[PDB]
Design a protein around this ligand. Structure first.
Ligand SMILES: [Mg+2]
Ligand SMILES: [Mg+2]
Ligand SMILES: [Zn+2]
Ligand SMILES: [Zn+2]
Ligand SMILES: [Zn+2]
Ligand SMILES: [Zn+2]
Lengths: 91, 267, 67, 579, 40, 528, 49, 49, 46, 116
């Protein structure tokens, strides 16, 4: 039930009954790089240029395109290093 | 070593092309292993080096080389005095690890020139003639139409024959068909016939016409293993069986000497 | 393309029994009796001759490039 | 009709369709009507009589042919529009006799129903016992088998060829084979198959093939490729010539062994070419202005093609230049991977090759050459495979090529079974087998018999790709085909989606950045325009802001770099803003 | 290399490329004016 | 025209940016290998001598990696490149004296792939998450990939020429990611359907069905030979079921030594009488139908697809849930090995002896098919007499077709039931269908029974030949033989009209396969 | 587009003895590429005078 | 002269139309090759109906 | 001994040089085949 | 082409050892024997003669992969008899069996050839 639930909830989330296709993502707030992939990269790119938009690069396809660790999966978190624990670890 | 078998063997046919022998009071493992050394590890001499320096036949070079290496070679008593071409202290051949062959045939007549075994001329008289050239003092017997070639076509090759097991190639496979059968009346029920009546009755069966199987023998086990080897001419049947037994003895003795080195090398 | 030197299944040298087989066929012998007469007594050693295209004959009708 | 059955209107396709209720007569005389020969039935009685069959039987001595049969008015050509006005019988033996009357006015009669099948579907024996999709799959695979494709293959120089060493006629043959000339140019071998589950290496459409068999010639084949090379002279002084490019005294040797080439520039027949071998040597001349004037343009053989040279031809084409064709012969033994398929729509790959000592064996030393799995039969209902094995057993024993004409009421399974029991075997065709590994009898009795298998031209040595770090493209710097066979595998949108589903950001990063197109670009923190001028004197500088201190490093695909540059070239400024 | 070890792009701002910025950023000083590739 | 360089497929954004071509990839045909664990693939030596893996020289690996550098590209286990501290790559083939090459801490040594490396294995079209699982390699010589049989169900792979792609991760982070996220033991239970995605497959399945029968008795040599094959074994032979007259181990005992840990389960074999659970003998089954795994030991039952393959609550499923991925992936390579070596003693076949039934049943089939045709003629006579009344809500053609189709389908079903009751326990069709390996009851019917009505587009064969179906039938022939019905079996041949009609029926299946192949990834792309 | 989407891939009762019912590419061109039956002959053409 | 019409092999206007088996072999041609393919630039072409 | 070619229809060794009118003597046929090499090649009879 | 030469199935490679001997810690008196470059010809006879003893509690063999050339034999014996002794006694029993059989077969061949 999880999967039917999530798909139906994604379709019926903005109040509309959105055609969950390219027609759907054209009517969202996704950035220029996302819609760059779908149909006509150059037209959406030029429209976003003349207007001066920005792609927050929080999506997955954008980070995958620009060759960076996608914000989801193993990349959702960031790792640090610990010094006090590295004391307990001579060799 | 108080746990050995004392087998008994009796023969029923000793034609110059097959032997038929019943090995009694033996385990099934040993019978199947004797069969496997018939088919796999009896040493025979066969061609394993061809150099075709003139070929106009409609068959290409690899074809003639293959079809020629599958010629059987009389390897009766000159396989125990030959050494595997790897353990020879020589370079790629010598009269101790090889038998040089030559072939030279061209068709200058109109009618097709069937190139046969007879055309292969060897370097050693008794050591190897090509079989089907057994003798003339005692049928076409062209051990193969190795190539048929018309006017203008020639064939010149130079073949060397080494010694080999049958696990290396089917060339060095002495036996044509090794027949095997135990419990021909199905007493042990190692096969469970549905409708046991439709099944034909074995040549070695000892059963009346009305009965189909034998009654269940709960305590018994395989014994009286039946055989029928055949030969591709390359080695007489009796010699095939004797060399199989000698080869199994050699295998087991080499295993024992290496095991002794290993046990004594370890603590 | 030419009668195989050995039965694929039972290793029996079958390449020598083809011209004799054609001879027996042009001798009024039937195929079963011709195969039994040549000693072939199994499926495999019999299918080598019973089903064999001898194409080297229709392939020898072409002239050779070397004279 | 009385005229078309002798001669005034061409006895060939001049159809006459009288549509009774509609009240029309439609006479067609034009090209493109598929006609069909059908006998004639006048008053529930054929027009064909024994006199015609006897005259046709003595064909070579007479001058009586099919045309004399059509002139006699016993066979006429019915096209399709005329077919909807005729009442046919399939067999005269019935459907022309008396019972509760189905039809008392027949008009024609089929010669033999097995003529509805085409060429590649007349090969399959007992095609009425198989499922129809399997019959189509056989019509497909039967066009991909190996055999003597034509007799004059030694004087053909074709781009790709395949000649099976020892092909065989089928043992269970359809009677419409002597017209496709299959007994003359066959495409398979009559292997001894056994539908057993021996050891597991034949599951999910796989076969266990006897290694001793394949080592005695079973299903060997040659692969005759044929390369081509023209000697062009396109521009003046831009002459290309066949000649062994020796060394300096010519430039561009490309570091390969030219020992093979004869003085002409072509390798000799019988020289074992390999991967790093040159087969043809050309030396095009420089423009003579601005080493000698001879560059090097020599044909290189790819490692996916190895073998021995068979023919070398030299001649003038229709464009007039000199022009050669070499032929490289390669002998293929069947090994793990190659596709074999029966005539009944069952394809498999050899998964392991056991030796004769290791295969099963009957009481008489017969070992199977192939062991196909039983699980192939039920979901596919190829019950023409089983019957083919049975008929092949009866045939190999008897001595006559069995008859498997599709619609024949005199070939019943029961009759084949009785014929087989007349020769000392189990009537259904099963036999008691043994296990070559141990010797013990296999409990169930394995179905064994001679079936007709084929070697398809999908050999695995033509399918292996492997790219570690190879030729890169000039524009995109994405992977690209090279000398060795592999140029890469696409990591498409579906695989990207699957790796998204897994949650592996790092592996997806590797596949789409670091295994295809890695790059570093210097970018200005102030203006995202990457037009930094990095230098190995360590001077990072951004013309456009007069700023040499605020440059940062950014890793991104050279594809993304090329995209942002092709955008900048349209006055669209992509700004990689690292802040 | 040593230029602020790699930072990851967090935003990509789009805009039209002004003439002044393009002139300053260009590496051809005068601008390309000879349609031929190479003379000597 | 730059705008065209940046355009649709084979463009930049979609072609060269989203889906690229990748290094460290291979592709060759798949061939079975029952002797490999479910987490292993068999790579040939060429693909392994081509692909490499950058390994850093820590003072642990230094001697081994210098030996590898010494070996060179020529021998198989070697190295292709050595990458120094600054990042400058050295080619191990073009060094004049390769012995002088000394490696320090921090250098990389790109070494040929060797047994133990992790690779991601993919079968196009990659539909679900379980189509890029990761395995360990095992370099065994012949030029085809080799993967276990229980792993064919996930990939939807059959070894009839399929090629499968191998990607070799090239860093420790990615190797660890694939090891702890995407390995095939960790992907048995799919989140899509709460089910195990990979269960025991056809040959081992028929073998375990024949092996868990209560009449299978092994003896000393056989039990030792089988115990030799299961990798998780204490080493203690269990005391046999039958002790005297002769030590005889039963099959369920040896199978109890491959059930992992203490698993408690209850299932139901396919041939379970529905009223067996209601009367007496509810827990002492007279046909071994009821499977009861109580404390790791198979107390009673006969195993099938409903008990150890791709189903909810299965022995494999609760094996996973209760005992973890590693023990479960050992639970697949023990069943396969043990039962697939016992199959050498038992053996499995299929022959014409199974596509035949006894004469009484063939006469019963023919009698039913005669009655069915007479009743169709009766309906046709009621229709031509205008005494047929339209069923509520349908025309007269519709009620006529409904009645004739109901008669024909009841005929096929009763014919098939008689066919299936004509079988013997030794029949192999029945073994493969009551096991679960392959084939349905409808196939046992179609081999010895009527083939059945051939529907095209959901209707009987149309009057496409101007009021007839073929020129051999007379006009207005609604009878069975005239619009599809194939009364003959597959063993008894098909009359020429029935063969053309069966072809007309199967062409629709081929077209359906073509359209489904065309639509495979449509919904998935659209809503990803 | 000349053939107005009349289902061309299906086997038609009209193909009896004119086209093989069991020979067609199993890929995308299913039912489109048909092979000729064994006794099927195409009309060559004759003037109707 | 107005051109060169390609010739279908083993048609009535080929150099192979009325030649026997031995003659075909002397011209190095397979006596079983059917005909019905043009030779255009060395590659055989068949015209699908 | 220069490159020895064979005529496809008169079957004569022609022996022409690098620069050559690739036609054959006494029979003007342009199709010519090269002669097998004289370096030995060794076939394992298997 | 990744196709092994056929001579690998019976020839030792570089210094690989013909027979190696480990000890498995699962049960008291067991001992694994890796026989290299052999097959079932030498496996099942050793197994079926290691099994006619009254002191060998476990004799069995395995060819771990049919594309590799290796067998493993596992011998667990009573606390008196060692596995090494059981293996060596089995090999001597088999050699004595085959020697007897060879002599019997020579006698039988000669009898059939002449005495009949
Ligand atoms: Mg598939
Ligand atoms: Mg499959
Ligand atoms: Zn020597
Ligand atoms: Zn044979
Ligand atoms: Zn800036
Ligand atoms: Zn000439």
């Amino acid at each position: 039930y999880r999967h039917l639930a999530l798909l139906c909830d994604t379709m019926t989330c903005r109040g509309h009954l959105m055609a969950i296709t390219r027609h759907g993502v054209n009517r969202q707030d996704t950035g220029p790089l996302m819609k760059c992939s779908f149909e006509e990269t150059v037209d959406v790119l030029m429209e976003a240029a003349a207007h001066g938009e920005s792609d927050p690069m929080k999506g997955v396809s954008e980070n995958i395109m620009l060759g960076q660790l996608a914000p989801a999966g193993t990349g959702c978190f960031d790792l640090l290093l610990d010094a006090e624990k590295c004391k307990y670890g001579m060799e | 070593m108080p746990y050995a078998n004392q087998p008994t063997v009796r023969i029923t046919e000793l034609t110059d092309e097959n032997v038929k022998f019943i090995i009694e009071n033996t385990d099934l493992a040993v019978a199947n292993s004797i069969r496997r050394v018939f088919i796999a590890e009896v040493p025979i001499i066969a061609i394993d080096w061809v150099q075709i320096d003139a070929n106009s036949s409609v068959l290409h070079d690899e074809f003639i080389a293959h079809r020629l290496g599958l010629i059987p070679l009389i390897s009766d008593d000159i396989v125990d005095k030959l050494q595997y071409s790897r353990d020879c202290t020589c370079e790629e051949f010598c009269p101790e690890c090889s038998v040089e062959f030559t072939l030279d045939v061209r068709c200058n007549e109109d009618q097709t020139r069937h190139v046969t075994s007879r055309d292969l001329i060897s370097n050693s008289p008794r050591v190897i003639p090509v079989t089907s050239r057994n003798r003339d003092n005692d049928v076409e017997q062209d051990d193969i139409l190795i190539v048929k070639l018309r006017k203008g076509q020639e064939l010149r090759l130079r073949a060397y024959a080494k010694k080999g097991f049958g696990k290396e190639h089917a060339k060095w496979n002495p036996t044509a068909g090794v027949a095997f059968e135990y419990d021909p009346d199905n007493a042990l029920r190692h096969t469970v016939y549905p409708k046991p009546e439709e099944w034909p009755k074995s040549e070695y069966s000892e059963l009346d016409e009305d009965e189909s199987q034998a009654p269940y023998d709960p305590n018994g086990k395989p014994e009286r293993f039946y055989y029928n080897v055949e030969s591709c001419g390359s080695l007489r049947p009796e010699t095939i069986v004797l060399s199989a037994l000698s080869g199994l003895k050699k295998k087991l003795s080499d295993l024992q000497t290496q095991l002794s080195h290993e046990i004594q090398s370890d603590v | 393309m030419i009668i195989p030197v050995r039965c694929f299944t039972c290793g029996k040298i079958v390449g020598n029994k083809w011209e004799a087989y054609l001879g027996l066929l042009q001798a009024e012998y039937t195929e079963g009796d011709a195969l039994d007469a040549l000693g072939l007594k199994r499926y495999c050693c019999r299918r080598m001759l019973l089903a064999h295209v001898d194409l080297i004959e229709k392939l020898l009708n072409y002239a050779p490039l070397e004279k | 009709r009385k005229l078309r059955r002798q001669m005034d209107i061409i006895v060939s396709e001049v159809s006459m369709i009288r549509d009774i209720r509609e009240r029309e007569i439609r006479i067609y005389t034009d090209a493109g009507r598929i006609c069909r020969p059908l006998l004639i039935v006048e008053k529930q009685k054929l027009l064909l009589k024994k006199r015609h069959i006897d005259q046709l039987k003595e064909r070579e001595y007479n001058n009586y042919s099919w045309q004399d049969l059509v002139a006699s008015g016993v066979v006429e050509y019915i096209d399709t529009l005329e077919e909807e006005t005729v009442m046919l019988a399939m067999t005269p033996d019935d459907l022309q006799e008396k019972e509760v009357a189905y039809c008392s006015t027949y008009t024609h009669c089929e010669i033999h129903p097995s003529m509805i099948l085409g060429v590649c579907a007349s090969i399959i024996p007992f095609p009425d016992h198989n499922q129809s999709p399997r019959n189509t799959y056989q019509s497909a695979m039967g066009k991909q088998a190996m055999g003597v494709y034509i007799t004059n293959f030694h004087v053909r120089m074709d781009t790709l060829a395949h000649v099976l060493y020892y092909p065989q006629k089928p043992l269970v043959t359809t009677r419409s084979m002597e017209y496709l000339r299959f007994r003359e140019l066959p495409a398979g071998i009559n292997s001894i198959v056994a539908i057993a589950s021996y050891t597991g290496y034949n599951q999910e459409d796989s076969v266990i093939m006897n290694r001793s068999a394949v080592d005695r010639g079973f299903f060997r084949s040659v692969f005759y490729r044929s390369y081509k090379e023209q000697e062009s002279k396109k521009g003046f002084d831009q002459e290309e010539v066949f000649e062994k490019p020796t060394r300096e005294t010519c430039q561009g040797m490309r570091h390969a062994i030219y020992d093979k080439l004869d003085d002409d520039g072509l390798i000799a027949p019988g020289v074992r070419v390999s991967g790093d071998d040159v087969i043809i040597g050309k030396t095009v001349t420089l423009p003579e202005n601005e080493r000698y004037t001879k560059r090097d343009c020599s044909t290189f053989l790819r490692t996916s093609e190895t073998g021995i040279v068979d023919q070398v031809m030299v001649t003038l084409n229709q464009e007039g230049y000199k022009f050669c064709k070499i032929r490289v012969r390669s002998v293929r033994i069947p090994q793990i991977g190659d596709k074999f398929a029966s005539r009944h729509g069952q394809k498999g790959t050899c998964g392991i090759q056991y030796r004769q000592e290791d295969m099963p064996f009957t009481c008489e030393g017969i070992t199977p050459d192939i062991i196909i799995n039983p699980h192939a039969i039920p979901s596919r209902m190829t019950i023409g495979h089983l019957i083919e094995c049975l008929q092949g057993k009866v045939s190999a024993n008897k001595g006559e090529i069995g008859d498997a004409t599709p619609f024949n009421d005199a070939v019943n399974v029961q009759k084949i079974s009785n014929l087989l029991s007349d020769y000392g075997y189990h009537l259904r065709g099963n036999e008691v087998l043994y296990n070559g590994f141990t010797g013990r009898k296999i409990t169930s009795q394995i179905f064994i018999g001679p079936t007709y298998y084929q070697r398809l031209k999908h050999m695995v040595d033509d399918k292996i790709h492997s790219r570690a770090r190879g030729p890169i493209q000039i524009l995109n710097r994405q992977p690209m085909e090279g000398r060795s066979r592999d140029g890469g595998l696409r990591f498409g949108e579906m695989e990207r989606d699957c790796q998204i589903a897994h949650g592996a950001a790092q592996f997806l990063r590797e596949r789409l950045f670091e295994a295809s197109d890695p790059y570093q670009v210097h970018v200005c923190n102030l203006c995202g325009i990457m037009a930094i001028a990095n230098t190995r004197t360590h001077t990072y500088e951004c013309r456009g802001c007069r700023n040499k201190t605020q440059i940062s490093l950014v890793r991104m695909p050279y594809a993304c770099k090329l995209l942002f540059q092709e955008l900048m070239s349209m006055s669209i400024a992509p700004r990689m803003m690292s802040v | 290399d040593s230029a602020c070890p790699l930072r990851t792009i967090k935003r990509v701002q789009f805009g039209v490329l002004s003439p002044d910025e393009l002139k300053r950023m260009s590496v051809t000083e005068g601008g390309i004016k000879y349609p031929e590739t190479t003379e000597g | 025209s730059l705008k065209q360089r940046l355009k649709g497929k084979e463009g930049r954004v979609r072609g060269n940016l989203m889906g690229k071509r990748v290094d460290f990839s291979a592709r060759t045909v798949i061939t079975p290998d029952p002797n490999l664990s479910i987490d292993q693939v068999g790579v040939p030596r060429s693909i392994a001598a081509n692909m490499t893996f950058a390994e850093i020289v820590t003072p642990f690996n230094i001697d081994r990696l210098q030996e590898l550098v010494r070996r060179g590209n020529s021998q198989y286990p070697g190295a292709k490149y050595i990458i120094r501290d600054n990042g400058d790559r050295i080619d191990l083939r073009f060094h004049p004296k390769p012995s002088d090459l000394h490696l320090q801490t921090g250098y990389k040594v790109e070494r040929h792939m060797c047994d133990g490396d992790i690779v991601i294995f993919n079968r196009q079209p990659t539909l679900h998450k379980m189509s890029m699982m990761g395995h360990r390699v095992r370099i065994l010589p012949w030029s085809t990939f080799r993967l276990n049989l229980s792993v064919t169900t996930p990939y939807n792979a059959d070894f009839d020429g399929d090629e499968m792609n191998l990607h070799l991760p090239q860093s420790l982070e990615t190797r660890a990611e694939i090891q702890e996220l995407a390995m095939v033991p960790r992907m048995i239970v799919t989140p899509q359907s709460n089910r195990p995605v990979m269960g025991i497959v056809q040959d081992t399945l028929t073998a375990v069905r024949k092996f868990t029968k209560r009449d299978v008795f092994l003896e000393r040599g056989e039990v030792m030979n089988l115990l030799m094959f299961l990798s998780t074994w204490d080493g203690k032979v269990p005391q046999p079921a039958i002790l005297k007259p002769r030590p005889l181990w039963t099959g369920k005992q040896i199978f109890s030594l491959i059930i992992p840990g203490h698993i408690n389960c209850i299932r139901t074999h396919s041939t379970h009488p529905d009223d067996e659970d209601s009367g007496p003998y509810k827990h002492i089954s007279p046909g071994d139908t009821k499977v009861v795994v109580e404390n790791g030991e198979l107390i009673m039952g006969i195993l099938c697809k409903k008990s150890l393959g791709t189903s909810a609550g299965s022995l494999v499923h609760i094996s996973y849930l209760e005992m973890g991925h590693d023990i479960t992936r050992l639970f697949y390579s023990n069943i396969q090995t043990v039962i697939n070596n016992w199959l050498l003693i038992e053996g499995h076949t299929i022959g014409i002896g199974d596509s035949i039934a006894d004469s009484k049943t063939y006469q019963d089939i023919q009698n039913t098919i005669k009655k069915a045709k007479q009743d169709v003629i009766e309906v046709i006579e009621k229709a031509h007499n205008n005494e047929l009344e339209p069923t509520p809500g349908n025309t007269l053609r519709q009620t006529f077709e409904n009645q004739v189709n109901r008669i024909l389908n009841d005929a096929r079903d009763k014919t098939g039931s008689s066919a299936q009751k004509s079988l013997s326990e030794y029949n192999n069709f029945k073994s493969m269908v009551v096991s679960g390996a392959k084939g349905s009851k409808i196939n046992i019917s179609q081999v010895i029974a009527v083939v059945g009505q051939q529907n095209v587009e959901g209707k009987r064969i149309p009057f496409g030949f101007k009021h007839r179906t073929l020129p051999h039938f007379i006009k207005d022939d609604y009878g069975p033989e005239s619009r599809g019905f194939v009364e003959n079996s597959y063993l008894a041949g098909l009359t020429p009209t029935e063969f053309f009609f069966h072809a007309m029926g199967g062409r629709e299946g081929l077209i359906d396969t073509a359209v489904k192949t065309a639509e495979t990834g449509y919904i998935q792309r659209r809503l990803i | 587009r000349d053939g107005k989407l009349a289902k061309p891939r299906q086997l038609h009762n009209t193909l009896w003895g004119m086209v093989c019912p069991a020979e067609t590419p199993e890929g995308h061109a299913v039912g489109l590429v048909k092979n000729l039956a064994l006794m099927a002959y195409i009309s060559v053409g004759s003037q109707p005078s | 002269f107005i051109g060169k019409i390609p010739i279908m092999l083993r048609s009535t206007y080929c150099l192979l139309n009325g030649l026997t088996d031995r003659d075909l072999c002397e011209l190095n041609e397979c006596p079983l090759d059917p005909g019905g393919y043009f030779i255009i630039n060395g590659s055989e072409k068949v015209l699908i109906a | 001994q220069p490159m020895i070619y064979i005529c496809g229809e008169c079957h004569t060794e022609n022996e022409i040089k690098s620069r050559d009118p690739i036609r054959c003597r006494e029979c003007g046929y342009r199709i010519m085949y090269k002669k097998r090499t004289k370096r030995l090649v060794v076939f394992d009879a298997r | 082409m990744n196709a092994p030469p056929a001579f690998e199935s019976f020839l030792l490679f570089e210094g690989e050892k013909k027979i190696t001997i480990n000890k498995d810690t699962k049960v008291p008196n067991a001992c694994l024997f890796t026989i290299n470059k052999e097959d079932h010809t030498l496996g099942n006879i050793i197994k079926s003669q290691l099994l006619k003893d009254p002191q060998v509690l476990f004799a069995g063999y395995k060819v771990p992969h049919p594309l590799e050339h290796k067998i493993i034999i596992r011998v667990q014996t009573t606390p008196d008899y060692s596995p090494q002794e059981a293996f060596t006694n089995a090999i001597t029993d088999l050699i004595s069996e085959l020697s007897l059989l060879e002599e019997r077969f020579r006698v039988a061949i000669k009898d059939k050839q002449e005495g009949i």
